[PDB]
Design a protein around this nucleic acid. Sequence first.
RNA 1: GGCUACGUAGCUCAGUUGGUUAGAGCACAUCACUCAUAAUGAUGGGGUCACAGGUUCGAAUCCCGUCGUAGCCACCA
RNA 2: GUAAGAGGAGGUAUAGGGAGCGACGCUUGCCCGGUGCCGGAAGGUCAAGGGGAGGGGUGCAAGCCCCGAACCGAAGCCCCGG
RNA 3: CCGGGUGGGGGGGAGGCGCCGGUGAAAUACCACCCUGGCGCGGCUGGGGGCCUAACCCUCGGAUGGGGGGACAGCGCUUGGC
RNA 4: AGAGCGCAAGGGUAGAAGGGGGCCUGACUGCGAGGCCUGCAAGCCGAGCAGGGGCGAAAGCCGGGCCUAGUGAACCGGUGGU
Lengths: 50, 93, 228
Amino acid sequence: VRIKLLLECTECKRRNYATEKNKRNTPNKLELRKYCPWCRKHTVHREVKI
Amino acid sequence: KVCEISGKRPIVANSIQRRGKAKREGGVGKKTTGISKRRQYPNLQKVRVRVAGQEITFRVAASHIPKVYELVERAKGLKLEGLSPKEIKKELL
Amino acid sequence: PKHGKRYRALLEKVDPNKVYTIDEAARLVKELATAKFDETVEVHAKLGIDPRRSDQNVRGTVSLPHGLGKQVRVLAIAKGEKIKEAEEAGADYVGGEEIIQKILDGWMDFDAVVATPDVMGAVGSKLGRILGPRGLLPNPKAGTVGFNIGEIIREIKAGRIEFRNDKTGAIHAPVGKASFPPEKLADNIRAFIRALEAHKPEGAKGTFLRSVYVTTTMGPSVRINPHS
RNA sequence: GGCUACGUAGCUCAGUUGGUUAGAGCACAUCACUCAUAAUGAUGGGGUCACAGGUUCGAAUCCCGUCGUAGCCACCA
RNA sequence: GUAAGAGGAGGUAUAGGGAGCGACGCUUGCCCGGUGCCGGAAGGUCAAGGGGAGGGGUGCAAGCCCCGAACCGAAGCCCCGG
RNA sequence: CCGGGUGGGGGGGAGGCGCCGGUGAAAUACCACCCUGGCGCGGCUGGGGGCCUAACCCUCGGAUGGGGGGACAGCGCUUGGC
RNA sequence: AGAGCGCAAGGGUAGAAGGGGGCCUGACUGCGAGGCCUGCAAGCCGAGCAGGGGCGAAAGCCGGGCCUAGUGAACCGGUGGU
């Protein structure tokens, strides 16, 4: 449910994608998790948009 | 009716106000989808101008009055005598 | 008598319907300073950001590619080690954690403060009723939080400038100093334009460059085409 | 969805562009006055100004963030 | 009646139309909370409209097309009471 | 805000004032803009009232006109409601 | 092994799935051998492969949760990119 909602992280250094979920209710300030983009190896990743 | 100048007669059915509801984009659409059908017909009016020897009335279009006074103008160019209402009026044009 | 005699002459020089631009402003508004000493070019800049917007009142921190030349002396409360940095910069009695009372126990003579982030906490809590409120204490962007804020001690000695919105954006660029002629005026004003366009809100419509009034400090000013 | 008004003492209600010193009647309280209840007066307990945030040296007095309440338009593959 | 016009009525508020009960005698009580209906020169939301801050495509440009803020636009519903 | 400020007319005259000091959030001549509320106008844009008649509507023994209403009504188009 | 293993119960488990700490982020990317299942459609399982990543002295585990419930084909359109 929206409270857990749905959000998507994106790499820095222009765009890139990967799909995830949140939990605003739970102490979830902001997210900057570490993943891998289509282009190149594992790098950064920032959370943004619905 | 039918204007005594450049025709101009009524328009029906798929003439319109339609109702419709239409479509645009304001989400998935303005309201998306939506549609219907209706009716629509011209203007007309009155110009009972003097001119020449007598008095004469007119059924004019919503933007063709200057043409009427022009008709007056051409009319003067000939001889307009004798008590003949619409008879002179028709002779004009 | 109303605005004085000097300003009535200096009234017959404005013709309150003009522009000048940074050019004619540099020159003729160099002239417009026949009252005393070093009048501060007062670029008075006004825009529109709803006199608070929670966080949209600039901060602008500038030394204007020339120099003021006045004083701040910084003072600073730079926890011993940091004092040393300020000891090569312009900072009177850098007192790591004890000149605090030569601010709090009523002993002025200073500006800026620079301090450190460490003491910021400490020294931000003690003097947050005079310095900060009125203008000095940290404001973590006014060249008053750090050790690289001593390179900023240098920056402030060369000129801090503080641009804030108050109620009209307003801000008063302070150079001119009625001893700079066309040159220094030209490049100072143009620099301030650059900083003006450096610090911009996140979506404030209107004119982010109406009022310029580049008055020295004693007289006329009428705009600068607020752009050129 | 969009825009409007509002939500403060157990009860109901004002103080609203500051800056002071957050109320009013009911009610609870130990008294006071009546020979006698009630009428009314006094002192206390109960605000945590819809919640936080930010503007201010200093907001219940303003902008901002969430909800509940309502109102009209208006959306729903 | 699309309409011209028609009746109403060449009648005029003791008259013309709509609804309930039904001579006559007694008599007709409480509820404006929901709703219908009367009224009301503050206001809330909304139409096209007026307007033009601001954006973009394109031509070297002059230019043209499109998007559109602030704020002013009724009936109405909310509103206030009968 | 009942305390002074703001403005003009004048007498009269060579004399009158601003910082720090002091107080508080702030220091108060002068300069720059802006806000608060206000007042006068200028660009745009509306609400409401009176009058005239010549549009248009009616009416009086043929009326070319006299008399009433009148920019509403009537009508065409478009706008939203019910 | 009657404890616990989020939630219902079944099945299962202390040679761990339970409970404590450390680094992290494999709710990984491009593919998927071959099988469950079966009217279609949808659902179920996963070796290995290659890119790189985390832990491990290592041998090695990792394509979310002990599993079975927590779900909606398509048509339409929003939004960022190619």
